[PDB]
Design brief:
Belongs to the CRISPR-associated Cas10/Csm1 family. This is CRISPR system single-strand-specific deoxyribonuclease Cas10/Csm1 (subtype III-A). It comes from Lactococcus lactis subsp. lactis. The PDB classes it as rna binding protein/rna. Keywords: Type III-A CRISPR-Cas, Csm, RNA BINDING PROTEIN-RNA complex. This protein is an alpha+beta fold. It has a domain of 153 residues: Alpha-Beta Plaits, CATH 3.30.70.270. Helices cover 60% and strands 13% of the residues. Strands 2-3-1-4-5-6 form a six-stranded mixed beta sheet. A hairpin with a 5-residue loop joins β5 and β6. α5 packs across α10. It is elongated. It binds one RNA strand through α4 and α6.
RNA sequence: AGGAGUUGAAGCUUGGUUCAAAGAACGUAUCAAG
């Protein structure tokens, strides 16, 4: 109820450190090998997760309830806006703490307000298992069909989302019916590949004078080069801007 | 004293202009949370 910007959903993060097993067992090489170094390694990992997770969630008023944390396990239920905006924060702070050599995978799920927590946790655990099945670092946005690498998600999806949010704000009457027709074409293009690309070019030059001279050609470029990213960018755009 | 021979011929048969715009994109109830 404090959120008054997006869709009334509850977003769920489950994360775990991948490849933690052989790194914890035999990670430090045999030449410069110490026992207290391993003690600092594991004690610093648990230390990081506990105190930096509480401080990173305290410094900005994130509407996130942490259930439990740890290296092996992480489970947080909150508003989906803060969960999505905090997953990149947690990934980058883990990369800074571990000097970006311990990988991390995660799974973001999104559920309605009154949903059972047991089925919630099982579904999001399934999502993050599908993320770690890719066998590298990745994340699933809301579904097992949308698996993205962390740099891919962060860079591609968030620059496309920020560009879309800059462009459709200054437009006075374009959204959101144009965006729904655009998503209809960009998900029909998976099966009927040619005619939806033709309809896409037709609509973009149709609304060249309306949505912008350069944004329409940018959408036409993005919808051929890195397509599947832009569908998720538009979907989370509407999920953010729904009143 | 009137007879014949032409009863229409050629040209254009539509030209250009916007060719679905804005809205809603599931809401609730058990499930859950408290």
């Amino acid at each position: 109820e404090e959120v008054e910007v997006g869709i009334n959903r509850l977003g769920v993060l489950r994360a775990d450190v991948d490849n933690l097993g052989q790194a914890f067992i035999n990670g430090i090489p045999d030449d410069y090998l110490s026992i207290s170094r391993t003690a600092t390694f594991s004690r610093a990992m648990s230390r990081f997760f506990k105190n930096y997770l509480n401080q990173l969630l305290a410094e900005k008023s994130y509407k996130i309830n942490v259930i439990y944390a740890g290296g092996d396990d992480l489970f947080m239920i909150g508003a989906w806006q803060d969960i999505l905006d905090f997953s990149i924060v947690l990934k980058q702070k883990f990369a800074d703490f571990t000097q970006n050599k311990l990988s991390i995978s995660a799974g973001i799920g999104m559920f309605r307000e009154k949903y059972p927590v047991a089925r919630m946790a099982s579904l999001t655990g399934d999502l993050e298992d599908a993320a770690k099945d890719y066998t590298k670092n990745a994340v699933t946005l809301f579904d097992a069909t949308n698996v993205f690498s962390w740099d891919t998600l962060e860079n591609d999806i968030f620059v496309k989302l920020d560009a879309i949010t800059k462009n459709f704000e200054k437009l006075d009457e374009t959204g959101k019916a144009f965006i729904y027709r655009l998503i209809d074409l960009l998900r029909g293009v998976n099966e009927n590949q040619q005619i939806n690309i033709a309809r896409l070019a037709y609509t973009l030059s149709r609304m060249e004078e309306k949505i912008g001279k350069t944004f329409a050609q940018e959408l036409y470029n993005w919808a051929n080069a890195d397509r599947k990213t832009l569908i998720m960018a538009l979907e989370i755009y509407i999920l953010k801007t729904r009143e």
